[PDB]
Amino acid sequence: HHHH
Amino acid sequence: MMAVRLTFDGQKLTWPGIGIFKATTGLPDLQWPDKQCVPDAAIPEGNYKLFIQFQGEAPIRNAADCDLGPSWGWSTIPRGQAAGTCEIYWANWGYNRIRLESADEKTRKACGGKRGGFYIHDSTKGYSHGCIEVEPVFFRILKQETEKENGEKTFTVNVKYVSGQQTNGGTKQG
């Protein structure tokens, strides 16, 4: 799960 | 040593018996309880465990793309070495982060289980990429309260939105  | 059950209502993160901290969840247009199944929106309601054990610097997964690896603890963001685009991206992390994990099946199955990777972090942007941005003083209270205790240290947070209000607690830098 990425955040950018 | 007593367990701590933090609460988060979209604008305030409460440490019962200690204090209330400004907090925010979601990207600017997604700070709403009816968007909690959209990626990077307000975090889904339910019960989460915090990993507060301090583990030092967060791992760097890809330095070129500014990618941080996951870690199950309280870690720091390597702002001092950021250059170019990473000065932008890592300012959205801040300086400290604490991993969260869904702590029951109802929370974990939310939104078809498509969302994840949640943290509490101390950027000062007024938004958060699918995590909880908190007032930085929270981490200093956390340090002071835990470093003098010898026994077990168990922290959770319950997320529950009780109105349609925007999930923005005023964390943007004044």
Author numbering:
A (entry chain B): 301 to 304
B (entry chain A): 1 to 174
Extract from the study:
One such T6SS effector is Tlde1a from Salmonella Typhimurium. Tlde1a functions as an LD-carboxypeptidase to cleave tetrapeptide stems and as an LD-transpeptidase to exchange the terminal D-alanine of a tetrapeptide stem with a noncanonical D-amino acid. Our structural data revealed that Tlde1a possesses a unique LD-transpeptidase fold consisting of a dual pocket active site with a capping subdomain. This includes an exchange pocket to bind a D-amino acid for exchange and a catalytic pocket to position the D-alanine of a tetrapeptide stem for cleavage.
To probe the molecular features of Tlde1a that may contribute to this activity, we soaked Tlde1a crystals with D-Ala and D-Met. We were able to obtain cocrystal structures of Tlde1a in complex with each amino acid. The interaction of both D-amino acids with Tlde1a is facilitated by a salt bridge between the D-amino acid carboxylic acid and the sidechain of R115. Additional H-bonding to the carboxylic acid group is provided by the backbone amides of D40 and G116. Finally, the amide group of the D-amino acid participates in a bifurcated hydrogen bond with the acidic sidechain of D40, a water molecule, and a carbonyl of the Tlde1a His-tag cloning artifact. Moreover, in the Tlde1a native structure, the D-amino acid binding pocket is occupied by a sulfate from the crystallization condition, supporting the observation that H-bonds are the primary mode of ligand binding. It is also important to note that the Tlde1a complex with D-Ala contains a second bound D-Ala. However, this D-Ala is at a crystal packing interface, interacts with unconserved residues, and shows a poorer fit to the electron density. Taken together, these observations suggest that Tlde1a contains a D-amino acid binding pocket that may have no sidechain selectivity for the D-amino acid to be exchanged.
